[PDB]
Design a protein around this ligand. Structure first.
Ligand code: CU
Length: 127
């Protein structure tokens, strides 16, 4: 299996803080869903992948871009993979090539929604 299921909920939480990608997968899929009640503008989430090196920069410029851009600088080359921003009752999936991921590199996933990254983040690692 070359996928993971992850939820972002109304208490500003992902349901994992460490994802592992089997390094023999050609592609890997992240299936994000929102089990809450709150509207997208107040507790909307996305799942965003970057290097540890780029995480805060992505989060900072993302907050500048704001809700109307899904809290991501458009065409940000630092974002390896991301889902759409989703609100209550919604789900989005993103697939990327495992060849984008390098050995000897540190990757972090996080929600880019304003202020959410502090709580909503973890590591992604090939194994
Ligand atoms: Cu969020």
């Amino acid at each position: 299996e070359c996928s993971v299921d992850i939820q972002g909920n109304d208490q500003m939480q992902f349901n994992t803080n460490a994802i592992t990608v089997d390094k023999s997968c050609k592609q890997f899929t992240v299936n994000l869903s929102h089990p809450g009640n709150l509207p997208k503008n107040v507790m909307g989430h996305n799942w965003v992948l970057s290097t540890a090196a780029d995480m805060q920069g992505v989060v900072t410029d993302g907050m500048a871009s704001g809700l109307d851009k899904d809290y991501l600088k458009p065409d940000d080359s630092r974002v390896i993979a991301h889902t759409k921003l989703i609100g209550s009752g919604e789900k989005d999936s993103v697939t990327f090539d495992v060849s984008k991921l390098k050995e000897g590199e540190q990757y972090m996933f996080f929600c880019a929604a304003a202020a959410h990254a502090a709580a909503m983040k973890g590591t992604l690692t090939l194994k």
